[PDB]
Each structure stands twice: as C-alpha cells, then as structure tokens.
Amino acid sequence: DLAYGTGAYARTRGNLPELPLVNLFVEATRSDQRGVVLQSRKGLVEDAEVGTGPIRGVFRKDGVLGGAEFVVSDDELYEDGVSLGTINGTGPVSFAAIEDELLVCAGESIW
Amino acid sequence: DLAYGTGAYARTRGNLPELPLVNLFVEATRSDQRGVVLQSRKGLVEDAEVGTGPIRGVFRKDGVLGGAEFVVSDDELYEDGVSLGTINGTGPVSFAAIEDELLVCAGESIWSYDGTTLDEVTFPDGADVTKVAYSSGYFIALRAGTGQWYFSALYDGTSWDGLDFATAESEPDALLDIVVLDGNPVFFGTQSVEFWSATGDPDIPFAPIQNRTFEQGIFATGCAVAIDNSFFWVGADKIVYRNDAVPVAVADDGIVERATGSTDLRLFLLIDERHKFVCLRGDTFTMAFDITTNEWCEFQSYGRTNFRCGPDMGDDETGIIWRFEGYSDNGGVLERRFRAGATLPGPFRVNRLRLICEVGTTPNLSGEYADPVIEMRASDDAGNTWGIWEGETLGAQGNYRQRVEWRALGLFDDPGMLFEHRMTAPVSFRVTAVTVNGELGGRSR
Amino acid sequence: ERRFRAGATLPGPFRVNRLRLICEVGTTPNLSGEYADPVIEMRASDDAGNTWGIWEGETLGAQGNYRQRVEWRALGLFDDPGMLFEHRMTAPVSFRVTAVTVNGELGGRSR
Amino acid sequence: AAQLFYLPFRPMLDANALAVPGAKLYFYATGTTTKQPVYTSSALTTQLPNPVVANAAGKFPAIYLNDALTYRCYIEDADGNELADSDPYLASIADELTDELQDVVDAVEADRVAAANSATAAATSAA
Amino acid sequence: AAQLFYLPFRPMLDANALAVPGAKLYFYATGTTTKQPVYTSSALTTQLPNPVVANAAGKFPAIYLNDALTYRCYIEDADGNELADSDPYLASIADELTDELQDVVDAVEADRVAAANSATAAATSAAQT
Amino acid sequence: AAQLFYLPFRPMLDANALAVPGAKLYFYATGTTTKQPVYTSSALTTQLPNPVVANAAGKFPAIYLNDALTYRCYIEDADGNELADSDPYLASIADELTDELQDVVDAVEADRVAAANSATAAATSA
Amino acid sequence: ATCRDIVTRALHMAAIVPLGKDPKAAEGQLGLELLQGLYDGWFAGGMFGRLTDVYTDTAYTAKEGERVTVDGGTLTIPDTFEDTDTGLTRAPRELAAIVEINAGNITNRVWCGGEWQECSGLTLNDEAPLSKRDAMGLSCLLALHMAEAFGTQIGPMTARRGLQFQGSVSYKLGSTQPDASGVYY
Amino acid sequence: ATCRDIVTRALHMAAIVPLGKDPKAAEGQLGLELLQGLYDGWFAGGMFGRLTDVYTDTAYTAKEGERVTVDGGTLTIPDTFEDTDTGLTRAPRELAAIVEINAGNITNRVWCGGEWQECSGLTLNDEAPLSKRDAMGLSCLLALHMAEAFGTQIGPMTARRGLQFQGSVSYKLGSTQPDASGVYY
Amino acid sequence: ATCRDIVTRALHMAAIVPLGKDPKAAEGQLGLELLQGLYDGWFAGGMFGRLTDVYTDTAYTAKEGERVTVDGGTLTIPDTFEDTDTGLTRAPRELAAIVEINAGNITNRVWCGGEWQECSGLTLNDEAPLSKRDAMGLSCLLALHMAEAFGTQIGPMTARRGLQFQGSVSYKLGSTQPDASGVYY
C-alpha cells in the first residue's frame, strides 16, 4: 500500500519532494477501512451571462430588494442582467444590504 | 466476521459503495460481546381516524383544556374528533397553549380556541404570522417577511399590540423559526441564530444575549426541533446542526447529498422506548438521526415513495394517526434491508455466510408467514451489479436453534464483497452479527 | 484535469511488479465519442520527482465495466531516494481515488 | 412452400437450451416474498395456485395478472433450484388491436362477403 | 418510465427441446381430428409418420409443414396425458395469445373456411354444372 | 385490469436452437449505430454496458430500457458474426399476428380472385 | 436408502449441513451428480472386473460380467444362472455387472440385494444401487468427494469408513466369487 | 454431458463460481480451451497408444489406432469390425482412436458409449467425448488446471479424483483390449 | 492458435493479466520474443534429434532431419516421402525438422498437423507452430518463463502442464517414428 499526498504540499526550498493535489480533495468516508478518499471537484458550468468585463462581485439575497441579484462588472452594476449604472473604484467590491437599501463599495465611493 | 453498516451511508458522488439501513437502527446491548445490535423499527398501527386529509399537526397536553386531542386535518381543526372550524392553509402548523388558551398558526393567521369557540385573532397591521410559540408567560409570533417578532400580553393570546415588537438586529432578513430552549426563545432566521432571554421587565420582556450568535441560518420554517437540552436545525446549506458552543454538523456527506436533491425539508421528532429520532424528511426520503447512538437510519413504508408517518406521528395523505406496535405496517409488509461486506486485497473464498439473528419468534402458525423468508444477494463490484436473491428460512414458531446460513458463495476479488440482506415479513427482526467461513459444528439443531 | 501523486521513501533497492489504482471505474456518461473509454496516465520517478519517465496510459473502463482494474506492470527497480508515481486524468467524467497499492495479490475472476 | 416446425409455446430453457419440466413460477409483491394472487382468465375470478407448476413438457398455462398491482416473478426448477428472478415485472408487451390488425380483419371480412355474393350470383346466373 | 426488455427473436425450438422421449406429435386439421400429412424436408416429397416419435436413440427428426393448409398441433404424453394443444398453428409466435387476439384469430380462420367453401361451391356446383 | 403474463427469461439461440455463449447485444438508435444506455434496474440509475455479454449459458441479465427513446437490437456472436437484427425494436405481439395473417389474407384474396373468375365464366357460358 | 437420503446423510457426516435439516436443491443436485459419476467411474474403470465385450443384433441373453453392444436386437437379463461347477440353479454372484450399449445409451446393471439394480439415469427419488450393503459407508464415500466443493475437509474416521466401503466393494469377500484363472504357457 | 456442464461443474468443484450458477463468458471460453487442449494433448502424446501412420489419396477404410493423412481421398469410419481372434462382427474396442489429417485440418475421433465422438473443434454446446465414463472425474481434471488461472488451488480429493479419471482412461482395464505383443529376435 | 492468443493465454494462466483482458504491446512483444527463443533453442538444441549437416549449391530436395547450407542454390521441401520399409508414399514423420541456412539467415520448418510450419520470423499474427498439439500446454510452457519477468511464480499445475507438453514433444510417442540404430563394433 502506497500513501498518496492527502494535501497539496509543494516546497521549493530544499528541493523537497512535491505532492500536488490538482482538483482533488480528501473526504472522510465510511464504506472503506482507510476512512478517507480523494474526490474530484465538480466542473464549472455557466449559470448567467451578465457583462463583458471581469465579475468583481456578486450579491444575491432572498429577502433583499425582492430577491433580485446584483453583479458588479468591470466598472458597471447589473440587476438581473439590466445595467443600473457605473461604479467608480478599482479595488475589491463590498456589499452591505438591508430590507430596502443596498450599498456597494469599490474603493473610492459608496453607491 | 463481516462488519455491517451501523448507519445509512448512501453517497452517490464518486460511485462509492452504499450501505443503506432500512427500518433498522443500531442499539447498544449488554448480552452480546460486540456491544451493539441492529433492532427493527416497530410497525405503524392506526390509533385514531381524524379528518379526511393529511395531518399537519397533533397537540395533546394533559394540563391544557382537559387533555383533548387537537388535530389539523388539512385546513380544519378537530377536538377529539369533533370539528371546530376552518384554518388557513399552506404554511406548517404550530401550536402554543396555556391552561385555558390554545393558539394555532398555519403560516397565514392565528386562531384562538378557549374551549368554547374558535376565533381568528386580529394581528397588528393585518400581517401574516409564520410561527407562534409560548415562553415565560408571553405569546411570541413571527411576522412573515420581516425580521421583527411580536409578543402578546400576560397569559392572553388574543391581545396583540402593534408597539410590542422586537427586531433581530444582527439578522437583516426575515426570521423563520422559534425554539423554546431552557425556557427562553431562540430565533432562527435566514442568516443568523439569535439567543434571547426573558429579563422580567414588563415593558421590554425579552433581551438578546450579546456575543452569542451562529452565522448559519435556517433553511425554512419547521426545520428546528428541541430535544435533550439542545436543539437541532437545518442550516441554509442543507446541513443538520446541533446546538453547542460551536455548532457541529451531525449530518455526514451522504445525508447532505440526499438533502440537496430535495427542495422541501422538514425536521421533526419521533419517539421509541428509549430512542429519540430527529427525523429529516424530504420529498422522496425520510432519514432519522438517533440521539442515543449518534447514527443515521432510513425509514421507509412499503409501496410508497416516502415514509407514511409525518411530523407528530401523523399520516401524510390520510386522516390516520399512527402508533408503533407489532411490526405489521398498516396490516401490510414491513421491509428491513441492510448490507454487510468487506474490502479485499486479493482473492478470497466464501464458503459459508452465517447470520446471528432472530429465530423462531413468529406469532403465526397457519399463515404464509408461519415461516418467514430472508433473502441474501451478493455482489463483487462494490454493489454496482447484483446477483439473484437467495432465500433462507428463519424457522417456524419455537424453532430457537435455526441456523440462517448460506453455502458456497464463491471467489471474490479486489473490489471486495458486499452482501445485501432483506426480509419483508411482519415479524420481529434483529441482526447480531454476520460471520464468514464460520466453524463447522453443531448439535441436532 | 485531476492529478495527484503517490510515493514512498525506501531504505534500499525495491522492485515494483504491479501498481494498482483502486478507484472509480465504469461510470462514464458517454457511450460513443472521445471519452467513451477515458484514459488515465501514470508516470514514475526514482529521483524524488525531479526527473520523470514517459506517461503510460490505462483505461478506466467503458460504461458499465464496474470490475475494470487499473493496473501497471512494466515497472522496474527503485533505489535509495524513493519512488514517486504521478497520476493524471483529463477527461470530463467523474473521478474518485480510494487507494494506491503496490505488489498486490494476483487473484481474480473474469474482471 | 414449406415451413420448419417450431414449438407452439415458450418454456424456460436451461443452460443447455432444454425445456425445464415442472418449473414453478412464484408471483410475489415487488421487493417482498408475500404471495400475490393470479387468475386463469381475464375476468379475474378463478385463482390459479400461485406456485404455478408447468407440465412435463415445460408448458405454462395462461396466467393473467391484476394490472392494478405490480408483481415480482421468481422462477424455480421443479426440485427447488433458483433459476431466475425479476423484482419489478413490467409487462411491456403490447397486445391491443392496432389499426393494422383491424384493417386486415376488416379486409378479410369484406372479401369474404364479396366471395359469398359472387358465389350466389354465379349460382343464380348458372342454374 | 422503465421498459422491461423482451427478446424479440422467436426461438428456433424443435421437438428435441421437449426433453420427453415418449412424446407424440400429432398434426390434425384445424378444428377436427382428421390426420394431415407431415413431410421430411423443404422439398415436401417424403412423408414422415404423422404420429411422430423419436428414433431408437431418442432423437426427434426434423418436421417440415407446408403453409398451404392450416395445421392443429397436439402433443401426447407417453402415459396418455395432454401437454400442448394449438388449434391454429401460428409459425413465428411463441407466447400465449390474449383472449381478444384469440377470438380475432379464429374469426379470421372461420372467415377463411367460409370463403373457401363458397369458392369451391361456386366453382363446382355453379360454374361447371 | 387484466394483463397476460409474458415470460421475460429469454436466452438467445442460433438457427440450431443452441445456447450462444458470450453473445454481444447492442442497443443502437433507430437506423443508426449510435449507442443508448441500458439500466440494470427499473430505477434507471445503474447502467449496464451497452454491448451486453451473455453468460456461458447464453442468458442475459435483466435489461431495463427508457421508453422515451426508440431502440434497435443488434446481436453478434462471440466472434463478431451477425446473428439477428431488429431495427425498429417492437415489443408488440400484434405485429407478429399481422405477419402471420399476411399469408391468410393473400390466400383469401386469391380465393376471391378465383371465385370472381368462376362467376364470370358461369355468367358468360350461361 | 434413496439417493436423496444418501446425499443428505453425506452432507450431515461432513458437518456441512446440521442434523435435522435437509439440504437445498443445488447441493442435492451436486451430490446426485457426484454419485452418478462415482458409479459410472466404477463401471467403466473396471471395479467389477474386466468385462468381456460382446456384440449382438438378434435377441441375446447375457451372462455376468459382460458389456453387450446391441445393434437392433433385444437383451434379456436373467435372474438365475446354471452353475457350471455344480449344475444346480443359482443366483448371480454378488456384485455381478452387466453393461448394455444401445444406440449410444449406456445402461449399467449390478446384482445386489437379490435383484438387478441400475446405476444409470439415477434421480433423487431412486433407490441407491448399493445402499443395502452399507448406506452410511456410501454416504461417507460421497462426502469424501463432496466436502471439497464446500471448502471443508472431513474427519479421518469418515474417510476411513468411506474407503472401507470402497475396499469392501472391491474385495467381494462376503460371498462366493468365481475362482481366479491364469495362463501357464 | 455437454462441454458447458463440464466447465460449470469444474468451476463449482473448484469453489470459484457460486454453486448452481452459470459462469461468465470468459470462464466458459477458458474452460473450453483448456478441455480442447487436454484432448489434443491426449491424442498427440500417445494416451490412446502409438498410432500407426497411414497415407492415402483414394477412398480408404479406417482401422483402430491409425493416423490417416488424406490429400484427395475419403476416409470411411466403420461402426463395426471383423474380429481376427473370434471371427464374428464386433464393436470397436473401448477408447479406440482415429486421427484424420485433411489439408491441415486435424480430426480426432474416439470410440466410447457405442459411438465415435470427435474431440476436435469442440464448442460449449457439443457433447463431451469422454463425459459418460466419469462426468465428475472429467470436471475435477479440468478444475485441476482451471483453478490456477484464478490464483487459487483445489483440495487434495478433487485432484485425486481427476488423476483417478486420467489413470482409468490410460489403463483401459474396464473392457477387452488387444493383447500386448513384443519382439524376440 | 495465433501467437497473440498463445501469449494472452500464457499471461492468463499466470494470473498476471486478468481474465478477459488483452495485454499491453510491451508484454505481447516480450511473449513473442520468448516464444521465438524457445523455438530457436528447440531447433538448435537438438530437441528434434541430431540434424545431419549437408551443404548444397545446386537445386537439392531435402529429406527429414537435416540442416542444409545453401550457397547459391535452391532448396525444395517435399510434402511426401518414399518409405524405405514398404515402398509406399507416406507423409513426413510427425515433428520432422528441416533447417535451411541461406545467405546468413536461418529458416526452421517442422512437420506438424499435416503441414510444414516455419518457426522463424514469427509475428503476433502468424499461426504459432506446434499449437495444434496442445495450445493451452504451449501457453503454460510460455508462462513458465514469462512469469519471472513480472515478479511472480506460477502454480505447480501450470508448470506440470508445461513440462508435460515439452515431454510429449520430446518423446514423439504419439505417432510412428524411425527405429533407433546403433554401432556393434
């Protein structure tokens, strides 16, 4: 019996042997005596196309603004695929929502 | 000595071998050296026929209104089999009672019964109430779609004030459930769990316990139960959680797989002599987590896509209330299925497969079940494909030395061997152990 | 792509006659096409992964072949630094790894 | 022309393709071993003995199943050997009058009347 | 839903599959007990003994029936027992016929009989005489 | 209602009525060679290999098909030679009854032709 | 004892099947086939002596210890013989074998218990052709070969009893047998 | 017994395939190939004696124990022979072998059960040429070689039965055989 | 049987390759080379007897059992021979070997199955020489040597079958063989 790399370990310092784990993760199981198995992560399939630039942030809450979803494109905000306006900022996008109001931040201004 | 599955583990991801436990649960024992045995669930027998539709809730408190039976068959309220009136529909039914007042909620409005007549309760702003509970002399109601909950006057359920409300600040969405734990209310919303305690101040009766919340919400209404000085709930990620300083996930990967495949989940509680089953019911399954043994079992009813007994021991499509007795499921067939086996590094010869089980305990002497038949079916490719069922006899009444053993199973290889045992007789059943290649002895058995 | 490694450090010379991959087999959703019989490749290294050999490919088995064995036989001798086998599969099918075995038993029945 | 003679029934064949004599068919409830009734005719009145026993030639009698119930078929050799089993028995064989058979029988009937009236006309016009 | 696969190819089972060496294969006319000829090969030249029995080795010979006439198959046990009776012998069907198909088929057979009787009556009695 | 029982345990035999060991049964699409899945149980979860290989006795396992599709049965022996083929997979005995009755309807048609000829000969002579 | 009883007691003596319980159909068929093969090997292997080969096509009456190929005649098995040494009528010698080959069908008859009993085409309901000599010995001999199919080995005493039965059949010491003859040139 | 039954019972006695269940296609093919190889090895290794070589090109009538090579003629296999010692018509001696060589096609025929059975080109549906002697013995002999391909081994009693069948075939003690002759120069 | 079939069955008997699975290209090539080496060692090692060394330069017709060194000539292999004992035409004796050394390359022919089969330049598609004698025995003999390359040892029965095949080839007891001669001075 050979012991495989349970976790992704790749050290370049000292030229230690590397045990990369690409698209596989350890999960505990009950059907096997060894207890753990390697399971593959599911593939990515498109759920909705919203804009052109990179998706900086996605927000969707059932009880916020009637359950509509909000997606930040490169420099644009979209609600259910409909553009709402242009958001200024080049940093990570943060959302803060209440029952009736949503605030979006991108580094400079609050919308 | 083959090792059988002590809990239902059906994980379809990665085509892992499945070890279902149907109508059987692990129970600790002292007579056997192995400590644990598999005990069969008791069959369902009708106790009372109330209404003409599915049972939504059953209430029976001896100290409330003389201990009458309050049953919600469909959209009607019945007291000891006598109709009281029409109740609102879709939402699940919640009860909250005191010595002389009973409030029933069905997700739309509140109905009050004081032993004389059933009256609709006027709520502030005419809003819809999702859940109604009782705590420390107050009646608590959750307004639908809002994160604020209202409380009534002292020992009065028909008097609700529009200003007598409190809001869960840390949860900006709407609340969904209430659990009365340790005499105090705990509120489950879509984003957080809030702990509130009664401060005894007449103007503000309840205050939140600061710095004690869980970031996991509740999936829907009716997915929280209270038992054993704790509460179980279903998170927004469809994972069953226990109450603790840090909540733990008592549901394994297979349980979450089954839960995710269903759209509706309901958490209720079932009682056997010493066993407290936290039952999670989906559209096509009904699993039960045992409190005493911390193991998951599966309950099924023959001929139906899901277990007959719903919340509060009520039927899911008929006006029958059930009770556990005689392993004769509604006068029909009670199926008990389980799987044993092992993984092998190479070839392995199976010549005998013995099952230490119940023998000679059938109460039938002139019927087709005078001698019950238990069928074993073997597989070598990790249970993916199976052979033909081979049946053995558990013995007639009084035959307490019957041997339940198969013969010459054959060569098994690297994936392993998996044997599935199924019995479908309305008789008591229990499995102690499964032995492979046992010693060949005996004395006129 | 799903890739992992299994290896061992040896005190001296070691001969590897068989390498078995107890994994998920016969669960392909495709009956005709390129991925009717998915291919998983294995490659070996004796210098702790610094230099590898050529990829050798096995088939996980067509749909329904639940008894397929993932075996590699043409493996040589491994000296002091240890042995490291890298496995890689690049087909859009489900994949689960249960165990990796070396020099297992030779028995079986028409798999 | 000439047609090779074949057996007029479908018995269960053993490993060597010989008809099993005295084979016993058991009809149970699906997933269970509970005995379920079988009927001789479509009226569902006379009940066959559920362990249906074939004759010495392997021929089975006409077995009619209650369509309102789902069945499990368990066949055995006369001495008790377990031959085959199907837990969900789906009678997926269609046996209704499709319009091809209906038009065939209608054409046969019409041609029969045509032949009869032609024969009568010939008899009247000749005698 | 789910469909149970049934093999659609009629088995090529001759008398040897009967596994009864004492069986007799009588071939009468459709409806009556008048005994019809049975031939050896497809040439329809050599006649088999119609009470067909196995040889000294217990092997049944090949049985060829001409499709021009309609036969009735009768299987006789060595002890005098009935085993398999087919009023109209249909060639490439092996399963039991439902009642509806049953009365359809013998109604068709009776229509054929009546048509043949009318045709021969018209040919002999009317036209020639 | 009432449903007639049909034997589902059918091993396949060649023209000599012998068991065919290792026979490969292919379930193709109607008129093409595209493969369709076949399932071990009625739940249609576990999938048998589309080329189903019979055991040494020539007996296939229980095969469950999806009625939403239309199948074609293609039998080959162990060596790959052709044994049988059914492009439209029909499971109705009615078509077999029609095939048997084709001969009788042609015979009755010829009978009608002969009767009409006899009637016209009688009319012309008399 | 019937063949079913022989198989049941053979399985009981090997402890494979507990006492008081009958075996399944599969083990019964396996035991019946094992017994049939044992009898066929005894007959073909020369256990009953080297059988004189004769070929007949008319009606023929056979004597003890022959294999007769019938090619259209009838074979008559007599229950009595004219003793050459003494001249008075006698029963056939114990364990006297007659083999008949008719159209590829082989029928083996052995004289035991005062009757000709067949060892061919045995079923589970037929009398065992040598149960009268020793039923338990025959069961032990059958178990000696049957136990291997179930992954078990019989005890030394069961094997000793089975080989004792086999040696008693081979020796034929119980009753008078024809005197041995040799060639002196 | 057919070759399918022989292979199935060989696997059952080896305790590899479950009792009463037919094996897969691979098991049947391997068993058939092993049985065919055993038969050809018996015919080529002199199990049926040293076969006299005969070459013919016209019509020829076969004799016992002959290897006839034909390149245009027809060899007739007779069902009877004229006994030289006694003069009457007799059946061929038990386990009499005739080999036909026709343009690279080898056909081995052995006389048993009153018929010539061919041991060449066997399929799973063909009758086993020597099953009537001991079906269980032949199954055990086949299992002796089958068990090794599955990574297992069988018990001593199954092996003893297999070699008993082989020795009974080699001995030919059960029936009349031609007298042994030698040279004296 | 083709060389691929023999290699596959050899790997199956050693249990190295699971039943029903074809081997890789590398193991097939290794088995083919092992079979070729076995044949070459049999021919050069004197398994078919001490071959008479003859040398020719014109057209020459070889007889049984020689190695012919051809230097600018033609060698004609005959399909029949004139038997010196009786004078009638006969097929070449079974396992008769003819070796031809032409232009530096070696061609070995053996007479089996009524035909001359070449054991030189064998690929995985050509029919394996001497496979008709016992295909499974030849597979076992090949496995006897192949199992070591995969770090495993075959069972006793497979090795016994392989040595039985080799001994049957060396014995030549199955058919007529030339009489042994000697020197008496």
Short mmCIF file of C-alpha atoms in Angstrom, two decimals, chain H:
data_model
loop_
_atom_site.label_atom_id
_atom_site.label_comp_id
_atom_site.label_asym_id
_atom_site.label_seq_id
_atom_site.Cartn_x
_atom_site.Cartn_y
_atom_site.Cartn_z
CA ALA H 1 -22.72 -34.21 -20.72
CA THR H 2 -22.13 -31.10 -22.81
CA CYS H 3 -18.89 -29.15 -22.51
CA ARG H 4 -20.83 -26.35 -20.82
CA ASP H 5 -21.87 -28.68 -18.00
CA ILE H 6 -18.30 -29.97 -17.67
CA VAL H 7 -16.89 -26.44 -17.36
CA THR H 8 -19.64 -25.34 -14.96
CA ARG H 9 -19.12 -28.32 -12.66
CA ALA H 10 -15.34 -27.89 -12.87
CA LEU H 11 -15.74 -24.33 -11.63
CA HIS H 12 -18.23 -25.42 -8.96
CA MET H 13 -15.93 -28.14 -7.61
CA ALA H 14 -13.14 -25.55 -7.54
CA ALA H 15 -15.45 -23.35 -5.41
CA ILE H 16 -14.83 -20.40 -7.74
CA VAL H 17 -18.31 -19.89 -9.22
CA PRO H 18 -21.28 -19.96 -6.81
CA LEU H 19 -22.94 -23.36 -6.67
CA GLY H 20 -25.86 -23.69 -9.08
CA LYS H 21 -24.90 -20.57 -11.06
CA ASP H 22 -23.57 -20.48 -14.61
CA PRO H 23 -20.20 -18.77 -15.16
CA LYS H 24 -19.41 -15.77 -17.33
CA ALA H 25 -18.35 -15.92 -20.97
CA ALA H 26 -14.65 -15.70 -20.12
CA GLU H 27 -14.86 -18.69 -17.78
CA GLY H 28 -16.64 -20.75 -20.41
CA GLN H 29 -14.13 -19.85 -23.11
CA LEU H 30 -11.16 -20.61 -20.86
CA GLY H 31 -12.64 -23.93 -19.78
CA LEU H 32 -13.45 -24.91 -23.36
CA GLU H 33 -9.92 -24.03 -24.48
CA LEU H 34 -8.39 -25.99 -21.60
CA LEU H 35 -10.56 -29.03 -22.36
CA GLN H 36 -9.70 -28.88 -26.06
CA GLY H 37 -6.01 -28.58 -25.25
CA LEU H 38 -6.25 -31.55 -22.90
CA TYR H 39 -7.94 -33.64 -25.60
CA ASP H 40 -5.37 -32.71 -28.25
CA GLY H 41 -2.56 -33.43 -25.80
CA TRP H 42 -4.06 -36.85 -25.09
CA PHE H 43 -4.33 -37.59 -28.81
CA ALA H 44 -0.82 -36.38 -29.66
CA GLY H 45 1.01 -37.73 -26.60
CA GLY H 46 0.06 -41.37 -27.07
CA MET H 47 -2.64 -41.67 -24.41
CA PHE H 48 -4.57 -43.86 -26.86
CA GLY H 49 -1.39 -45.71 -27.84
CA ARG H 50 1.15 -45.23 -30.60
CA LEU H 51 -0.93 -44.53 -33.70
CA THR H 52 0.25 -46.21 -36.90
CA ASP H 53 0.79 -43.69 -39.69
CA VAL H 54 -1.19 -44.30 -42.89
CA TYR H 55 -1.08 -42.19 -46.06
CA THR H 56 -3.89 -42.36 -48.60
CA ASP H 57 -5.09 -40.49 -51.68
CA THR H 58 -8.04 -42.65 -52.79
CA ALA H 59 -11.00 -43.94 -50.79
CA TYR H 60 -9.83 -45.77 -47.66
CA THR H 61 -11.46 -47.57 -44.74
CA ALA H 62 -10.17 -46.67 -41.29
CA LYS H 63 -8.80 -49.09 -38.69
CA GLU H 64 -8.29 -48.79 -34.95
CA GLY H 65 -5.35 -46.70 -33.78
CA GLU H 66 -4.49 -45.05 -37.10
CA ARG H 67 -3.30 -41.59 -38.13
CA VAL H 68 -4.56 -41.27 -41.71
CA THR H 69 -3.28 -38.43 -43.89
CA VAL H 70 -5.57 -37.80 -46.87
CA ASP H 71 -4.93 -35.40 -49.76
CA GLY H 72 -7.82 -36.07 -52.13
CA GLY H 73 -9.46 -39.28 -50.96
CA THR H 74 -12.24 -40.01 -48.49
CA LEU H 75 -11.72 -41.96 -45.27
CA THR H 76 -14.67 -44.06 -44.11
CA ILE H 77 -15.08 -44.58 -40.35
CA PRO H 78 -16.67 -48.01 -39.75
CA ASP H 79 -19.04 -48.65 -36.86
CA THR H 80 -18.13 -52.36 -36.74
CA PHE H 81 -15.07 -54.54 -37.26
CA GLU H 82 -14.28 -58.16 -38.09
CA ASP H 83 -12.62 -59.74 -35.06
CA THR H 84 -9.47 -61.63 -36.03
CA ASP H 85 -9.39 -63.84 -32.93
CA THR H 86 -13.03 -64.98 -32.97
CA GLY H 87 -14.29 -64.15 -36.47
CA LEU H 88 -17.63 -62.57 -35.56
CA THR H 89 -18.60 -58.94 -36.04
CA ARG H 90 -17.61 -56.80 -33.06
CA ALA H 91 -17.83 -53.22 -31.92
CA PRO H 92 -14.62 -51.16 -31.90
CA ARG H 93 -12.57 -51.53 -28.75
CA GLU H 94 -13.19 -49.01 -25.99
CA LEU H 95 -11.11 -45.83 -26.38
CA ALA H 96 -10.12 -46.60 -29.96
CA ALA H 97 -8.64 -43.53 -31.64
CA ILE H 98 -8.62 -42.49 -35.30
CA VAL H 99 -6.96 -39.27 -36.47
CA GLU H 100 -7.75 -37.67 -39.84
CA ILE H 101 -5.37 -35.15 -41.42
CA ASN H 102 -7.03 -33.33 -44.33
CA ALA H 103 -5.13 -30.34 -45.76
CA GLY H 104 -4.07 -29.13 -42.32
CA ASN H 105 -7.40 -29.97 -40.65
CA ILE H 106 -7.00 -32.41 -37.75
CA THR H 107 -9.99 -34.51 -36.69
CA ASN H 108 -9.66 -36.80 -33.66
CA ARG H 109 -12.36 -39.44 -33.16
CA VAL H 110 -12.58 -41.74 -30.14
CA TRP H 111 -14.92 -44.69 -29.68
CA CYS H 112 -16.94 -44.54 -26.47
CA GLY H 113 -20.52 -45.22 -25.43
CA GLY H 114 -21.02 -47.14 -28.65
CA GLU H 115 -20.25 -44.18 -30.90
CA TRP H 116 -17.41 -42.24 -32.50
CA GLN H 117 -17.16 -38.83 -30.82
CA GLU H 118 -14.97 -36.08 -32.26
CA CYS H 119 -12.59 -34.33 -29.86
CA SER H 120 -11.58 -31.61 -32.36
CA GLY H 121 -13.25 -28.24 -32.81
CA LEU H 122 -15.39 -28.53 -29.68
CA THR H 123 -17.81 -25.78 -28.69
CA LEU H 124 -19.67 -25.23 -25.43
CA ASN H 125 -22.79 -26.81 -26.96
CA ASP H 126 -21.06 -30.05 -28.02
CA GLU H 127 -21.18 -33.27 -26.04
CA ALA H 128 -18.03 -34.04 -24.08
CA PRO H 129 -16.37 -37.03 -25.80
CA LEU H 130 -15.50 -38.78 -22.51
CA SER H 131 -18.15 -37.49 -20.09
CA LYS H 132 -20.03 -40.80 -19.94
CA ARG H 133 -17.04 -42.51 -18.32
CA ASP H 134 -16.94 -40.07 -15.39
CA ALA H 135 -18.51 -36.63 -15.75
CA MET H 136 -17.42 -35.59 -12.25
CA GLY H 137 -13.96 -37.04 -12.86
CA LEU H 138 -13.60 -35.01 -16.06
CA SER H 139 -14.84 -31.91 -14.23
CA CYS H 140 -12.24 -32.44 -11.49
CA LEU H 141 -9.50 -32.99 -14.07
CA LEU H 142 -10.47 -29.75 -15.80
CA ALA H 143 -10.59 -27.91 -12.46
CA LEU H 144 -7.05 -29.12 -11.71
CA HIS H 145 -5.87 -26.75 -14.44
CA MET H 146 -8.65 -24.14 -14.21
CA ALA H 147 -8.02 -23.27 -10.56
CA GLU H 148 -4.53 -21.94 -11.29
CA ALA H 149 -5.77 -19.20 -13.64
CA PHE H 150 -7.88 -17.77 -10.80
CA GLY H 151 -4.99 -17.53 -8.32
CA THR H 152 -6.31 -20.36 -6.14
CA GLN H 153 -5.92 -24.12 -5.68
CA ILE H 154 -8.28 -27.01 -5.05
CA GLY H 155 -8.28 -29.66 -2.35
CA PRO H 156 -6.46 -33.00 -2.44
CA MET H 157 -9.63 -35.05 -3.01
CA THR H 158 -10.59 -33.19 -6.20
CA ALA H 159 -7.06 -33.71 -7.53
CA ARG H 160 -7.21 -37.39 -6.58
CA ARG H 161 -10.49 -37.78 -8.46
CA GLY H 162 -9.03 -36.04 -11.51
CA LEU H 163 -5.94 -38.24 -11.64
CA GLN H 164 -8.17 -41.26 -10.97
CA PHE H 165 -10.16 -40.39 -14.10
CA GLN H 166 -6.94 -39.88 -16.06
CA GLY H 167 -5.49 -43.19 -14.85
CA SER H 168 -8.71 -45.03 -15.63
CA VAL H 169 -8.60 -43.61 -19.16
CA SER H 170 -4.94 -44.61 -19.56
CA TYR H 171 -5.39 -48.10 -18.08
CA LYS H 172 -8.42 -49.19 -20.14
CA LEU H 173 -8.98 -52.02 -17.65
CA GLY H 174 -12.78 -51.88 -17.85
CA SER H 175 -13.15 -53.60 -21.24
CA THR H 176 -11.43 -56.06 -23.55
CA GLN H 177 -8.24 -54.72 -25.14
CA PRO H 178 -5.80 -56.09 -27.73
CA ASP H 179 -3.15 -58.37 -26.28
CA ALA H 180 0.33 -56.95 -25.82
CA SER H 181 2.92 -58.24 -28.29
CA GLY H 182 6.70 -57.90 -28.41
CA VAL H 183 9.74 -58.83 -30.46
CA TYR H 184 12.01 -61.80 -29.79
CA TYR H 185 14.93 -61.57 -32.25
#
